[PDB]
Structure formats: C-alpha cells, structure tokens
C-alpha cells in the first residue's frame, strides 16, 4: 500500500563534517520506543536520510558494519511498529564533495552503492522504497540524469519489485521542475516502478530556512502553486510523483492554512508527501514535528486529519482515461 501521508525521520545524516563520526554525538538513529509514538499517531510511512560516506567509507567496497547495522536496527524497529521505510541516500549527488560522474566518483561507484543497499535490505519487510539521491544541485545537475540511471540499474540488480524515487536537478525543486526535468525522460526502469520525488518549501527562496514570516501579501495557495509545475509535468508525460520534503514553522497559523491547501491538492492527485521533519535529535529546529517540551506541533494534527483519508492504489497522478 502507498500511504499519502508520511514523515521524514532525520538524524543519521547529521554533522557531515565528522566522518565516520560517532553515533550519539554527531549523528542519531531512533532510540527504543521512537517509532511507537509515530505509529500511535497514525503515521505509517517514514523517509529516512542516510549519509553515503558513513555507509561506504571507501567507494566500491563493503558497507560499513557499524553504520549499516544501525540501519538494520532501525528497520527492525520500524517493522515492530507497523512503519514502512523509504531509505534516502542524502547526498546531493556528491561523495566527499565530488559530483557523481567526475573522475573521483564514477557512475559505476554510485551503481555499486545502490547495488549494496538493495542487496542488504531487499529482504527487510519494513523497507518500502529507495529514494536514490537527495537534492542534486549546482555542478551536479548536468551529470545527474546519467547518475540516476546508474542508481536505478544498481537497485534493480537485487530488488525488482520496490518503487524507486528519483529526485530532480536544482534541489529537486517542484516549482522549477519543468525547467530541467525533460532530461529525466530518458530514464528507464525495467520494473516500471519509478516515481519522481520533488521538494517544496514555502518561504520566499524555497530553501526552508524561513527567513521571513508569511508577510502582508501572503497567498494561501502558495504551496499548491509551487507544486503545480511538477504535477502538471507528470500528467503531461504520463509519470508518477511524490513530495519527499515539505515543512513549515509552528509560529504562524497562515503557514498551516497553506499546508492544508497543499495536502488537499496532493490528495486529489494521489501524490504522497513526507513532512520534513521528525527525528530523535532536532532540538529547537523550527520545522521539527518531534515532540518537545513547550512546543505545539499543529502540523501533526493536520497530517493526522489527512492520514485518515483513503490512500490511492498507486502513486499518482492517475492516468488520463
């Protein structure tokens, strides 16, 4: 089943400056009882960021025992708690700051990573899908479509069933999607289970930093307006979609109204969303929906209303008929 409502659970990718880094100091996996809270809230799909450099300290070599085992543990806990997990290689189309497709990081090395990820986890019941790369951007954009095919090829050697979530150029911007996405039309998935995943924030620069409030001229449909270019492209090209990140601060009711409008539009078009973000070690982060003393998380109540609505049969938008 494809859940329309889901959340990111971030932390395993934190403190990119420290490699390998230390669990519990630089990065954080869900502790005991973590998924039970979210399951009880009625959330059954999670997107989980992972750091490539921690999974694979050397290219074209075996996955790191300790970090990969933490992923094993997380998947086990998700399964215990009725949660389905999208593994996200949260790397901006780069390995140790070098773009996939450059001499340092050949596409074959990225294919190798994806082979190893699918080989290790394809047998895990909690695994739902693979988001093969978070937010290609900048000098990675031009080479990304070639890298994406290599990633698809890698997963499909070992997992011929699960959805592949394919992000786009320019931080997978939903708003700018059609400017660049035609380059993705050459991608092929022999299993026919490929889904494009765009990101949308509704601050002025769409970075999610929220440097300003809604403003005097706030438009409630801002979220919808920013995903329309993506969804319309999907319809035009007969493709399937997904929103892998969207988040808002908890300090202005207007953001919630925009979120509501967005959720309605995505629901209508059978496009699932992963809210950014929950996680075990966010502290005061403005977009966090993790429970924290003294903080209300109105975004959660809203997600819960939607979570009750029927899911679609598959990733939308529905084919024309």
Ligand X SMILES: OC[C@H]1O[C@@H](O[C@H]2[C@H](O)[C@@H](O)[C@H](O)O[C@@H]2CO)[C@H](O)[C@@H](O)[C@@H]1O
Which chain residues interact with ligand X by CB under 6 A? Answer: 135, 171, 173, 199, 201, 205-208
Q: What distance in Å separates the CA atoms of residue 65 and residue 62, rounded to the nearest whole number?
A: 8
Min CB(115)–ligand X separation in Å = 27
Query: Residue 167 corresponds to which tokens in the numbers above?
Result: 């992000």
Residue where the block lists tokens 């990065």: 27
Query: With respect to ligand X, which residue has the nearer C-beta, 17 or 294?
Result: 17
Query: Residue 22 corresponds to which tokens in the numbers above?
Result: 């230390």
Q: What distance in Å separates the CA atoms of residue 285 and residue 292, rounded to the nearest whole number?
A: 10
Q: What distance in Å separates the CA atoms of residue 67 and residue 174, rounded to the nearest whole number?
A: 32
Query: With respect to ligand X, which residue has the nearer C-beta, 151 or 208?
Result: 208
Min CB(310)–ligand X separation in Å = 30
Query: With respect to ligand X, which residue has the nearer C-beta, 1 or 207?
Result: 207
Q: Which residues pair with residue 50 across a beta bridge? A: 89
Residue 321, judged by CB atoms within 10 A of its CB (0-12, 13-18, 19+), counts as exposed
Min CB(172)–ligand X separation in Å = 8
Alpha-carbon torsion (301, 317, 90, 124), positive or negative: positive
Query: With respect to ligand X, which residue has the nearer C-beta, 121 or 201?
Result: 201
Min CB(210)–ligand X separation in Å = 11
Query: With respect to ligand X, which residue has the nearer C-beta, 149 or 274?
Result: 274
Q: What distance in Å separates the CA atoms of residue 97 and residue 17, rounded to the nearest whole number?
A: 11
Min CB(199)–ligand X separation in Å = 5
Residue nearest to ligand X (CB): 207
Q: Is 228 helix (H, G, I), strand (E, B) or coil?
A: helix
Do residues 13 and 50 make contact, with C-beta atoms less than 8 angstroms apart? yes
Query: With respect to ligand X, which residue has the nearer C-beta, 136 or 208?
Result: 208
Min CB(169)–ligand X separation in Å = 11
Query: With respect to ligand X, which residue has the nearer C-beta, 35 or 255?
Result: 255
Min CB(173)–ligand X separation in Å = 6
Residue 156 C-beta-side C-alpha neighbours within 13 Å? 16
Residue 130 vs residues 88, 139, 169, 236: alpha-carbon distances, Å? 6, 24, 18, 24
């Amino acid at each position: 089943s494809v859940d329309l409502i889901g959340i990111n659970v971030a932390g395993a990718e934190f403190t990119g400056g420290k490699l390998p880094g230390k669990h519990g100091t630089h990065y954080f996996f869900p502790p005991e009882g973590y998924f039970e809270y979210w399951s009880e809230q009625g959330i059954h799909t999670v997107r989980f960021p992972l750091k490539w450099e921690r999974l694979q300290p050397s290219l074209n070599a075996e996955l790191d025992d300790v970090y990969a085992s933490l992923v094993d543990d997380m998947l086990d806990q998700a399964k215990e708690n009725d949660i389905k997990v999208i593994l996200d290689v949260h790397n901006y189309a780069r390995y140790r700051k070098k773009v996939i497709g450059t001499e340092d990081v050949p596409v074959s090395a990225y294919q190798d990573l994806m082979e190893r990820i699918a080989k290790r986890w394809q047998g895990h019941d909690a695994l739902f899908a693979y988001d093969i790369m978070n937010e290609p951007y900048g000098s990675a954009d031009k080479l990304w479509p070639a890298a994406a095919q290599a990633g698809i090829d890698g997963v499909r050697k070992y997992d011929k069933k699960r959805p592949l979530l394919i992000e786009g150029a320019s931080w997978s911007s939903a708003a700018r999607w059609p400017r660049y996405a035609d380059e993705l039309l050459k991608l092929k998935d022999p299993a026919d289970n490929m889904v494009f995943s765009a990101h949308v924030y509704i601050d002025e620069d769409a970075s999610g930093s929220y440097k300003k409030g809604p403003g005097k001229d706030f438009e409630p449909m801002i979220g919808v307006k920013r995903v329309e270019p993506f969804v319309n492209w999907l319809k035009e090209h007969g493709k399937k979609g997904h929103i892998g990140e969207f988040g808002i601060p908890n300090d202005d009711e207007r953001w919630l109204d925009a979120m509501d409008k967005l959720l309605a539009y995505l629901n209508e078009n059978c496009i699932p969303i992963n809210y950014w973000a929950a996680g075990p070690s966010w502290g005061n982060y403005k977009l966090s929906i993790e429970p924290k003393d003294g903080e209300k998380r109105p975004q959660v109540a809203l997600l819960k209303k939607y979570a009750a609505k029927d899911n679609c049969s598959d990733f939308g938008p529905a084919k024309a008929e």
